[PDB]
Amino acid sequence: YSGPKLEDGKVTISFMKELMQWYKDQKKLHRKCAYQILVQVKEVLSKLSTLVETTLKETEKITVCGDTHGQFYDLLNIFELNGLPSETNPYIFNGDFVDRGSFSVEVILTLFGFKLLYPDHFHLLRGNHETDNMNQIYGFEGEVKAKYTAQMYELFSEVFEWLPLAQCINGKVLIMHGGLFSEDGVTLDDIRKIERNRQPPDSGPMCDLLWSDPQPQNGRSISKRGVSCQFGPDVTKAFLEENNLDYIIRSHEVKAEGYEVAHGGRCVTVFSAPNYCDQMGNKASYIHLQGSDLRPQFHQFTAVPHPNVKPMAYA
Ligand SMILES: O=C(O)[C@@H]1[C@H](C(=O)O)[C@H]2CC[C@@H]1O2
Ligand SMILES: [Zn+2]
Ligand SMILES: [Zn+2]
């Protein structure tokens, strides 16, 4: 093995560039480097609040991406389009890094590696697919067992349970993967107290944050997903009012243009997996915010070439 090696047991910026090239060429990170990343990233993530609270000063910016779904070569395209993560080019990836696409291992190890290199500026939130249920069925477990072992997979599963569930920028924008809640009256403080290091339950706030979807009409509906609900603009507006927030950003649904802004501006969807599963034909986007003006700016982009491995080949 002549592949990327950690320097003094730790991730550095040449290690990350070597890993990206290595993975682009479709090679495997040695199992012990992988293990060292996973156990160090568990340690980092387990000190985080369930709600990450970040301050963006006026000349600072942050990029928000939504679901990426094992589409590694499109992840590389985002970094070419937008620049590598760094203390001055912060990122939040809003859940759903794995499943569906067949380069989930490459995506998750690159994002974990960057979380290690810039822990105050590179942010990962849980989505509905960072879960054992989902991974068993949709590709990730099959992929970790083909490339590594059942054991390495259990370690992934445990790391995911410590990924924070939401992030609030400047007490004004809150970002979560799914959306808002199936009961009124939830506060940021309640979110901060969810004990997140578990598989999600069937109902309740932790389930809503990973699973819920906005609807255009006022009220709440039973979800067609079979879990959580659909929340209308009256839901968003009461939630934003009680918590003193401006709007939320979520992901969790494919959009033709890569973004949508529902609820009169209050509920934004960002989706970062272009030509999702090699089929949907959609565009993707990411959002920039800056401290002096937190309104979202969307940047769209389309799929790039990748190796001939079919989506879900590992399911
Ligand atoms: O992100 C998607 O395209 C889908 C839905 C989502 O919940 O985010 C979910 C189920 C399969 C995919 O992940
Ligand atoms: Zn989702
Ligand atoms: Zn998804």
Swiss-Prot record:
Enzyme Commission (EC) number: 3.1.3.16
GO MF annotations, alphabetized: ADP binding; ATP binding; G-protein alpha-subunit binding; Hsp70 protein binding; Hsp90 protein binding; identical protein binding; lipid binding; metal ion binding
Catalytic activity, reaction form: O-phospho-L-seryl-[protein] + H2O = L-seryl-[protein] + phosphate; O-phospho-L-threonyl-[protein] + H2O = L-threonyl-[protein] + phosphate
Annotated control of activity: Autoinhibited. In the autoinhibited state, the TPR domain interacts with the catalytic region and prevents substrate access to the catalytic pocket. Allosterically activated by various polyunsaturated fatty acids, free long-chain fatty-acids and long-chain fatty acyl-CoA esters, arachidonic acid being the most effective activator. HSP90A and probably RAC1, GNA12 and GNA13 can also release the autoinhibition by the TPR repeat. Activation by RAC1, GNA12 and GNA13 is synergistic with the one produced by fatty acids binding. Inhibited by okadaic acid.
Tissue specificity as recorded in UniProt: Ubiquitous.
GO BP annotations listed: cellular response to cadmium ion; cellular response to hydrogen peroxide; DNA-templated transcription; double-strand break repair; MAPK cascade; mitotic cell cycle; negative regulation of apoptotic process; negative regulation of MAPK cascade
Binding-site residues for Mn(2+) 2, renumbered to this chain: 96, 128, 177, 252
Active-site positions on this chain: 129 (proton donor/acceptor)
Cofactor note: Binds 2 Mg(2+) or Mn(2+) cations per subunit.
Keyword Transferase: no
Cystine connections: none
PTM entry text: Activated by at least two different proteolytic cleavages producing a 56 kDa and a 50 kDa form.
GO annotation, cellular component aspect: cytosol; intracellular membrane-bounded organelle; nucleoplasm; nucleus; perikaryon; plasma membrane; protein folding chaperone complex; protein-containing complex
UniProt region (Catalytic), positions on chain: 9-315
UniProt: Mn(2+) 1 binding residues: 67, 69, 96
Localization per Swiss-Prot or TrEMBL: Nucleus; Cytoplasm; Cell membrane
Cofactors required: Mg(2+); Mn(2+)
Swiss-Prot/TrEMBL keywords: Acetylation, Alzheimer disease, Amyloid, Amyloidosis, Cell membrane, Cytoplasm, DNA damage, DNA repair, Hydrolase, Lipid-binding, Magnesium, Manganese, Membrane, Metal-binding, Neurodegeneration, Nucleus, Protein phosphatase, Repeat, TPR repeat
Keyword Membrane: yes
Family, per entry: Belongs to the PPP phosphatase family. PP-5 (PP-T) subfamily.
Functional description taken from the UniProt entry: Serine/threonine-protein phosphatase that dephosphorylates a myriad of proteins involved in different signaling pathways including the kinases CSNK1E, ASK1/MAP3K5, PRKDC and RAF1, the nuclear receptors NR3C1, PPARG, ESR1 and ESR2, SMAD proteins and TAU/MAPT. Implicated in wide ranging cellular processes, including apoptosis, differentiation, DNA damage response, cell survival, regulation of ion channels or circadian rhythms, in response to steroid and thyroid hormones, calcium, fatty acids, TGF-beta as well as oxidative and genotoxic stresses.
Assembly behavior: Probably forms a complex composed of chaperones HSP90 and HSP70, co-chaperones STIP1/HOP, CDC37, PPP5C, PTGES3/p23, TSC1 and client protein TSC2. Probably forms a complex composed of chaperones HSP90 and HSP70, co-chaperones CDC37, PPP5C, TSC1 and client protein TSC2, CDK4, AKT, RAF1 and NR3C1; this complex does not contain co-chaperones STIP1/HOP and PTGES3/p23. Part of a complex with HSP90/HSP90AA1 and steroid receptors. Interacts (via TPR repeats) with HSP90AA1 (via TPR repeat-binding motif) or HSPA1A/HSPA1B; the interaction is direct and activates the phosphatase activity.
Protein name: Serine/threonine-protein phosphatase 5
Species for this entry: Homo sapiens
GN (gene name): PPP5C
